Amino acid sequence: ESNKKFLPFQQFGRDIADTTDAVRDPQTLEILDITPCSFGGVSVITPGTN
């Protein structure tokens, strides 16, 4: 759910990197926010294989 106050003539929301982050549902005039799913980096710690 989005707390942004869209103007009645606006349909999309963009960010700094020019990607859509807020959307309006075509059926119900409701504002939604899109967030990328969880991600991260993995490191492996090991001694020598001998």
């Binding site: 989005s2 707390n3 942004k4 960010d15 700094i16 990197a17 982050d21 926010d33 967030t35 990328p36 969880s38 991600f39 991260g40 980096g41």
Partner: protein, 100 residues
């Protein structure tokens, strides 16, 4: 007193070091900028979350500030209680006016 560590404060830093740390403003310290913080959605999207969402990350340094402060305090104590003797071998005691 202005350069020795202050035991009253938790981080044990001298007043001059306190002023130096307060003067410099840091953006990201390599701490845990948790994905929960970015998904908090406080309607104020900073540049850090935008950088994180595109594959750019910042790693923390190996040595913390407390360890560097400890090293500085050890150097100060060595140069005050011994002079230049501890830099070439065992530390030898000497009164400060005689050293000066």
């Amino acid at each position: 007193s202005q350069i020795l560590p202050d035991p009253s404060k938790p981080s044990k830093r001298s007043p001059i070091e306190d002023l130096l740390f307060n003067k410099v403003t840091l953006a990201d310290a390599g701490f845990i900028k948790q994905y929960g913080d970015c998904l908090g959605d406080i309607a104020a999207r900073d540049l850090i979350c935008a950088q994180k969402f595109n594959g750019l990350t910042v790693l923390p340094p190996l040595l913390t500030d407390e360890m560097i402060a400890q090293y500085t305090s050890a150097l100060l104590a060595g140069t005050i209680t011994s002079g230049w003797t501890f830099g070439a071998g065992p530390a030898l005691q000497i009164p400060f006016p005689m050293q000066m």
